[model samples]
Target chain A: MEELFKKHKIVAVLRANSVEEAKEKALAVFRGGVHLIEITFTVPDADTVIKELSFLKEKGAIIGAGTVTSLEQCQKAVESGAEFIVSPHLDPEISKFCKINGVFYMPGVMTPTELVKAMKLGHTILKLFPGEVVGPQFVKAMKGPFPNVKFVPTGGVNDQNVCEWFKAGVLAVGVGSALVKGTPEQVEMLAVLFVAKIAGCTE
Target chain B: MALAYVMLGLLLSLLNRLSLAAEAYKKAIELDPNDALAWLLLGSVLEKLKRLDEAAEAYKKAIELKPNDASAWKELGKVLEKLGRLDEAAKAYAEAIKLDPSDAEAAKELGKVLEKLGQLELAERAYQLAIELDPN
Candidate 1:
């Protein structure tokens, strides 16, 4: 389960308005070879979407719940079959829940202090929210002190510069509209092309 | 004639005309099939074009022509890894490491492929070696 994050390297974050739309987008990206999908609670019926896509786990997709803010939401996401939980802010309680359950929990962090706090809580995998503001240099700078920590930079990641983030040493990147904005077929093609670009970088 | 085509290919590649550069490289290889550099360049351009299978073939030919070219071997390992042939990729990376033990990038990549192959212990050693070679 942990290896899925490293193996896929690209996580498609779906922020659609409805469960049906999210499902459609998820299938499209999965068909395009993206094996990791994060359905954020910002969408309507996000839990339902997560449940609907749970079956994809059988087909090798790692389904996750994102935009999680509260402990109740965390429990609901897990109940809906989310193998992983992602939050926009650092919440120790939610992190504790995930740790107790042995589920992967990645909370957003920006400052060195927040990073230290999260690490102290035993959550090594983190999301650098609004990654466009922090940029790749930030990740490189942080590596000096936190060499073992894994970062998944989300927000503002696109096909044009996804490779740059990977080169800067991220575990994986979370891409949203950039991956889900187009038609289903186009989304699949974009997913394939993005994976190819990321593969080129890792090689 | 092959030199002329190679020069043109290099210029086209620099201009981001990868398909045109590939054509130039093909002509160079046609004129002089033994041009290992031409084969290597063609492999790079084809890789940028996302024609990975062709890129792998070109790199193989390059390695065949210059068996000791560590760069060619490293590139072949990369293409093979991207193709999800981890065993072959690991072998190519091992060959590159054998030819040039100082290549930290090759060692690091070998570690990644090894991890993919589920040889966790060997992967850890390769990663440690890479860090030892270049702490940065």
Candidate 2:
């Protein structure tokens, strides 16, 4: 599970008003070749969506939880078979829970201090959230002080500018509204576009 | 042996082997917990490594042992500012200024936090002092 989980480059972030929409969007992205599906807590009955999609794990679908705010939420998400957890802020308790459960925890970090604290706690790969505000230069500057830390930028990443993030030194990028808002064909096209964009960058 | 380890940690830090330097600094602290300089050095490396809370605690320990160490207080203040504890940072910077009235950098940093905290009137005095102290 750990090996398969780390293999994904484009994580499909899903947030919808209905569980059906969430599940459908996730499958669309998965079918489009983007296999890392994150069902955020904002989605109604999020665990239901995760549980329904958990079966895809054997077929290479990485089901995970996002917008996880508390340990209780982490527990519920993991029990529902979430393979990883992502949060918008730092929470050591959630980190400990993820550690003990053997699940991946990618907490959000906006400050160098928070990044260092998370590293001290043994988390090297972090999510540079709201990636639009700080821009890629933030990663460039952080590399000087934290050369080994790996960043997966989320938000403000799309077909036109995804390469900029890769150029700035990120392990992966998460796409949400843009990828999930469209029809099944649209989402698949976006997934294919992002995959190609990232592949071009890694090349 | 303690001072020897401190020097070794400094060398490792300059060479960019930070984790090893942290361990060496830990050894120095273990050998002589009362050595304020060792604590201060450990805090510096830890801060560079982004172990910010640990760095703050180490700087606080150094300040506890040597209350008059303006540098230690300034280190604590800087870490606190990074942690976003503006009020606590202001207090530490204020204490450092009390110890060393000529610290322009500390004064400037203190002014920044005060200005951010909406204490613009107080920030003005400190910011003006920083320019006067260094003439820059």
**What are the clashing pairs of model 2?**
none
In candidate 2, what are the lDDT values of residues A1-203, reduced to their tens digit?
33443465788889899988888788878876788888999988898889998778888888999999988888889999998899988889999889989999999998889999999888988989989788899999999989988888888887667778888888888888867777664565456445544554566
Ten-residue region with minimum lDDT total, candidate 2 chain B: B120-129
Model 2: per-residue Cα lDDT at residue B120: 66
* lDDT (tens digit, per residue) of candidate 1 on A54-136: 78989888889999999999888999999899997999999999989888899999888999999999977899998989998
Model 1 CA deviation exceeding 4 Å by range = B1-136
Lowest lDDT block of 10, candidate 1 chain A:
A188-197
The two-chain DockQ for each candidate, comma-separated, is: 0.03, 0.01
Off by over 4 Å in 2: A1-6, B1-136
Writing each residue's lDDT as its tens digit, candidate 2 over B1-136 gives 9999999999998999998998998999999989888899999988998999999999988988999988888889999999999988987887677667677888889889878988665566567667756885
Give each candidate's interface RMSD in Å.
14.1, 26.0
